[PDB]
Amino acid sequence: IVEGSDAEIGMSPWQVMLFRKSPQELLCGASLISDRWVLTAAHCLLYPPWDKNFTENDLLVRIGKHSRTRYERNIEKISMLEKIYIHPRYNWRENLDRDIALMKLKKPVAFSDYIHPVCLPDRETAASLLQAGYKGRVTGWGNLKETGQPSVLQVVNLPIVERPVCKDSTRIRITDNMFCAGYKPDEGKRGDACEGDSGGPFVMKSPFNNRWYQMGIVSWGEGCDRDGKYGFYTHVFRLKKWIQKVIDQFG
């Protein structure tokens, strides 16, 4: 996260770290959506251009974390993966269209002050909140700058951007399964996701029921926090029928 700040304790209790077993290293962010299901970006698990194709036994999820590198004894919980599910129309070839994946945990994780699931939006919450200018919040342990790494989880609040502005900011083909967020050059303020924040959540606090909803997944950008560029996020609601199909069938 570029131009963010240290998270408060318990500020993002749905935050999940995807962790490689060997070598032990951070792979991505992710989010807790129930006691057995974790949501992330498909490219965190499958990205053939970079020879990335993880299997369940390659990975762990670490839940309840604040510190990036510490083993947070008596606070974090570490879970093994039962199964990975990647969207069947995830487009790793071109533009990361449908950049979404689910991971089912081998055993349910116990909720605590530090571990708690985020809500997924329904159609009405998405229609109300996914509007240009409305701000969401992005969290992660990724790079602090485009070209180091944070001691603790970072947080930044960013406005959703009008779709024509998103489209006009890049040569990559945008789809309805994406939205973009960030400040414009004339707005002064700054901030962005960056490499290592992939898969983490873009959340909004509904003013109707005072609950946090995950509207996006950190998906892609061109550099980090560049003037005239924006971060792109998977549109969770647009892909929710797939999420529900997987959870109903498997779970």
Binding site: K21, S22, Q24, L26, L60, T69, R70, Y71
Partner: peptide, 10 residues
Amino acid sequence: DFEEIPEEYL
């Protein structure tokens, strides 16, 4: 880099 995690998880 990263503090070692308990062996039980590996």
